[PDB]
mmCIF file of C-alpha atoms in Angstrom:
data_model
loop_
_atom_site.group_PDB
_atom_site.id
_atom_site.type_symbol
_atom_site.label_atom_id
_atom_site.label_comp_id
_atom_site.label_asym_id
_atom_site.label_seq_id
_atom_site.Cartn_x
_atom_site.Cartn_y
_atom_site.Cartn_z
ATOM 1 C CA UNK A 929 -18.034 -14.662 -8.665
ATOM 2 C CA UNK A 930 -18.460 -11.399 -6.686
ATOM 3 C CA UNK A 931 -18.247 -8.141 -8.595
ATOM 4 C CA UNK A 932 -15.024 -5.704 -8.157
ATOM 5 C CA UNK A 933 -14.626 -3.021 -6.723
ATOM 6 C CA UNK A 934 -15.945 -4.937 -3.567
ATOM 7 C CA UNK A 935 -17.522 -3.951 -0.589
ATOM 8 C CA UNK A 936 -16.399 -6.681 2.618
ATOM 9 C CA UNK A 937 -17.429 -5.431 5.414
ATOM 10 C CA UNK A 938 -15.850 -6.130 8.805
ATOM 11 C CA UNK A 939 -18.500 -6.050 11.409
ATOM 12 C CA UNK A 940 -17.529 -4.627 14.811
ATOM 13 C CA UNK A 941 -14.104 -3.606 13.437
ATOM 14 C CA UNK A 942 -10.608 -5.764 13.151
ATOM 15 C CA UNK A 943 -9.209 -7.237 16.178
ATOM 16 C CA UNK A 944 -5.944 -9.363 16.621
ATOM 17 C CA UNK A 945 -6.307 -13.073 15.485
ATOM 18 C CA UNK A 946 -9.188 -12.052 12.487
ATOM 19 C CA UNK A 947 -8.068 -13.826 8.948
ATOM 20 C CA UNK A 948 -8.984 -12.444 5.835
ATOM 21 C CA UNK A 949 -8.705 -14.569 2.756
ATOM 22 C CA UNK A 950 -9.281 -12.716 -0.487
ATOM 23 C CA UNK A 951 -9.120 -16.027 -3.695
ATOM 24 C CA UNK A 952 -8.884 -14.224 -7.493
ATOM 25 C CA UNK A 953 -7.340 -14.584 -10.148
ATOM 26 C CA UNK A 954 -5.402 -11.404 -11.985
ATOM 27 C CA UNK A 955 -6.414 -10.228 -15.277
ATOM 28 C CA UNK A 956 -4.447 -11.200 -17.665
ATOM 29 C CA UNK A 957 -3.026 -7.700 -18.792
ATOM 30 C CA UNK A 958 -3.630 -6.469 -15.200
ATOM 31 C CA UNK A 959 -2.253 -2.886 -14.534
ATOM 32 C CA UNK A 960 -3.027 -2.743 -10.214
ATOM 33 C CA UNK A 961 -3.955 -4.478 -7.362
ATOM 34 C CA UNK A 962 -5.307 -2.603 -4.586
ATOM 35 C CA UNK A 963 -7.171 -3.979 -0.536
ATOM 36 C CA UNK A 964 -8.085 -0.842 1.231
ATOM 37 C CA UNK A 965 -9.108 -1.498 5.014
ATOM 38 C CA UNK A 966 -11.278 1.426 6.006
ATOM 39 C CA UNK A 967 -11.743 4.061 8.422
ATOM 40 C CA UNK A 968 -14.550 6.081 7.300
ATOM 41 C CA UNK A 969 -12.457 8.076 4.960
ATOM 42 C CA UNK A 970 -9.714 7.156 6.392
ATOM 43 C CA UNK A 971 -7.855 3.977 5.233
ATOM 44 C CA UNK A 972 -5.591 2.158 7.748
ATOM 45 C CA UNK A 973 -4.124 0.100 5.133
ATOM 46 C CA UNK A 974 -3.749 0.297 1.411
ATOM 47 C CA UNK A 975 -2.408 -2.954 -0.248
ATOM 48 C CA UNK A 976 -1.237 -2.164 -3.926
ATOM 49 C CA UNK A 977 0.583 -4.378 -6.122
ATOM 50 C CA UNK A 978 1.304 -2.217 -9.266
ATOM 51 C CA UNK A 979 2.464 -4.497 -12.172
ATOM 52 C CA UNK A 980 4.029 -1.916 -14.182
ATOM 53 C CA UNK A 981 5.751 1.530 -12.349
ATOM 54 C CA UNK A 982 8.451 2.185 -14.386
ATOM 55 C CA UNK A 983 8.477 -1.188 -15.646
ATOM 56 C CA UNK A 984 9.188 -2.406 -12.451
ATOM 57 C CA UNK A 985 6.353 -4.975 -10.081
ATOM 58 C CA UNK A 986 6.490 -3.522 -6.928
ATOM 59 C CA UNK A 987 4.015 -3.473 -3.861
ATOM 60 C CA UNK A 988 2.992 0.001 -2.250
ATOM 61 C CA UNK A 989 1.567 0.081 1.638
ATOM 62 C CA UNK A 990 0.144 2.951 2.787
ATOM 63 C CA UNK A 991 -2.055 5.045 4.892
ATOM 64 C CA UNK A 992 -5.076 7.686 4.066
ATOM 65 C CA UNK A 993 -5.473 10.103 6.560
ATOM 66 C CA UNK A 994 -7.912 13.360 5.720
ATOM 67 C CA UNK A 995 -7.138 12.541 2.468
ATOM 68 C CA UNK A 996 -3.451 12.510 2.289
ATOM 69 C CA UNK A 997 -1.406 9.721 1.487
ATOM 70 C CA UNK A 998 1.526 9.009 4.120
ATOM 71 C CA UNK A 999 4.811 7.509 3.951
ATOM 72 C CA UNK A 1000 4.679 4.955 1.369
ATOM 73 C CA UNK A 1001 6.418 1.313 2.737
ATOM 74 C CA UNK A 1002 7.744 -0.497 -0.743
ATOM 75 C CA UNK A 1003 8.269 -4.634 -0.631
ATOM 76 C CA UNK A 1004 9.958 -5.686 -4.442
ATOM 77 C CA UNK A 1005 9.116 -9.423 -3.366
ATOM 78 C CA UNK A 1006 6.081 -9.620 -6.168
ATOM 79 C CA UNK A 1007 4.058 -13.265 -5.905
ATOM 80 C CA UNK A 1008 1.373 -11.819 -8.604
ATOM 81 C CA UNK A 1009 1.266 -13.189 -12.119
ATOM 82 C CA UNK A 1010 -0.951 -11.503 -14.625
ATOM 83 C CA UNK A 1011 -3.252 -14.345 -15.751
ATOM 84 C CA UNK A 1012 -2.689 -16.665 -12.821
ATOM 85 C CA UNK A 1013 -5.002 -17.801 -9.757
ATOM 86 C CA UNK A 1014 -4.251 -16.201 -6.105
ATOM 87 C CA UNK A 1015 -5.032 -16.111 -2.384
ATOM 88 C CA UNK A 1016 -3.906 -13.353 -0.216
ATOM 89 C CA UNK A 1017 -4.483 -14.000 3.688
ATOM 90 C CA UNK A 1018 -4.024 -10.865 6.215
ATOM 91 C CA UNK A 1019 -4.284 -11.875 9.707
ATOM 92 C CA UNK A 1020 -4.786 -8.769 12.607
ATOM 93 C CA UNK A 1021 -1.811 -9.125 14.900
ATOM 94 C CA UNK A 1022 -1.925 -6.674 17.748
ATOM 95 C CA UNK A 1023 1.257 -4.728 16.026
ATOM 96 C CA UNK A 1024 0.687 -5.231 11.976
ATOM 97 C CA UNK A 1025 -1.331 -6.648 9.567
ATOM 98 C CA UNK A 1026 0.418 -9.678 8.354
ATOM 99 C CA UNK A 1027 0.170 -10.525 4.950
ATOM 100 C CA UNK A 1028 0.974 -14.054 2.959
ATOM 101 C CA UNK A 1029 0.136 -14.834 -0.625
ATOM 102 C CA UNK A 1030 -0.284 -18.348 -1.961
ATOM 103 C CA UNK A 1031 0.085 -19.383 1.581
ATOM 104 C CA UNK A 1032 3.908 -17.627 1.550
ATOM 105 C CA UNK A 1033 4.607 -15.072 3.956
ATOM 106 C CA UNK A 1034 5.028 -11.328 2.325
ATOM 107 C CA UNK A 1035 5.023 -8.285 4.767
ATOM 108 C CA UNK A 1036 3.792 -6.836 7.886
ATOM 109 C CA UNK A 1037 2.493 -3.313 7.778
ATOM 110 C CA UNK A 1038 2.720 -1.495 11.667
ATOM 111 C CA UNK A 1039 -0.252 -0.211 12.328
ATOM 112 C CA UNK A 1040 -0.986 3.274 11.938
ATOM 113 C CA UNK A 1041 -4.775 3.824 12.397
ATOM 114 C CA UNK A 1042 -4.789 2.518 16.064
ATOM 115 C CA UNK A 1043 -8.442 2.343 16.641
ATOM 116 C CA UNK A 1044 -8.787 -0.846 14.871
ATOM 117 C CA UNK A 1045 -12.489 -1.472 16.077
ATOM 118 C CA UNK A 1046 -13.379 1.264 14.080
ATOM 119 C CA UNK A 1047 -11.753 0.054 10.787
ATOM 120 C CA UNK A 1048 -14.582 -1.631 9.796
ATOM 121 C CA UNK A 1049 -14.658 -2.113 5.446
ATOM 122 C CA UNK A 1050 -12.147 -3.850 3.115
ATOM 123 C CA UNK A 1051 -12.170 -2.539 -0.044
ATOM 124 C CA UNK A 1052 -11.453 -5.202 -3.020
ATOM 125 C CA UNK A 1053 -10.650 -3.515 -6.512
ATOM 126 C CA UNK A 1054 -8.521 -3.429 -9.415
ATOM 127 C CA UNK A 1055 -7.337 -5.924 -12.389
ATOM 128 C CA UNK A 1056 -8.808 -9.338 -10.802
ATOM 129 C CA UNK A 1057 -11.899 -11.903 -10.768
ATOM 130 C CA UNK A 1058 -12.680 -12.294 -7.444
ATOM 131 C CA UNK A 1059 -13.789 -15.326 -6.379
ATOM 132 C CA UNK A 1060 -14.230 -15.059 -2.634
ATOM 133 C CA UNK A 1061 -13.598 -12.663 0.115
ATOM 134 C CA UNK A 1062 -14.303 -13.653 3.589
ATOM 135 C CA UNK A 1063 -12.717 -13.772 7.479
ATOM 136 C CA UNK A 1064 -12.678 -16.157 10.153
ATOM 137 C CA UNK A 1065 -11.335 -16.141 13.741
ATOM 138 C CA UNK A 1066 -8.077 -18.055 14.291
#
């Protein structure tokens, strides 16, 4: 088991056809989610399940640029169950990330940040055990 928040870094940057698999399991009274790839300060793409805005499960996408948040992209398609193992793959494509959980396709996110050598951290954190983070070339 790796500790949260986690630290994966991404040597070299993200590049089209890089996988990232991220296996956990959520907490069982788990409030947030949250993958941030990083830019420095910057992050290119924030991942955020929330489990409970306004008693509603949504996911939030966004960007971090000198610390602002951006325009906030909202999916209501919610594969997370507090309690309950996951696996979230994002694979680089040269428009979007592309993100599946439990091996079902959920959203693309354009990208916004388009220097994606230099995004070069994914931050893990929130209400899970995390049981692996890694990438692979497909």
């Amino acid at each position: 088991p790796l500790i949260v928040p986690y630290n994966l870094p991404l040597p070299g940057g993200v590049v089209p056809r890089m996988l990232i698999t991220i296996l956990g399991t959520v907490k069982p009274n788990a409030n947030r989610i949250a993958l941030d790839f990083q830019r420095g300060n910057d992050v290119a793409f924030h991942f955020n399940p929330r489990f409970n805005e306004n008693n509603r499960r949504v996911i939030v996408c966004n960007t971090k640029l000198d610390n602002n948040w951006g325009r906030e992209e909202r999916q209501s398609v919610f594969p997370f169950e507090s309690g309950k193992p996951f696996k979230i793959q994002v694979l680089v494509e040269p428009d979007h990330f592309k993100v599946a959980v439990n091996d079902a396709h959920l959203l693309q996110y354009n990208h916004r940040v388009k220097k994606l050598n230099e995004i070069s951290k994914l931050g893990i954190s929130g209400d899970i055990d995390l049981t692996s983070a890694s990438y692979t070339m497909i």
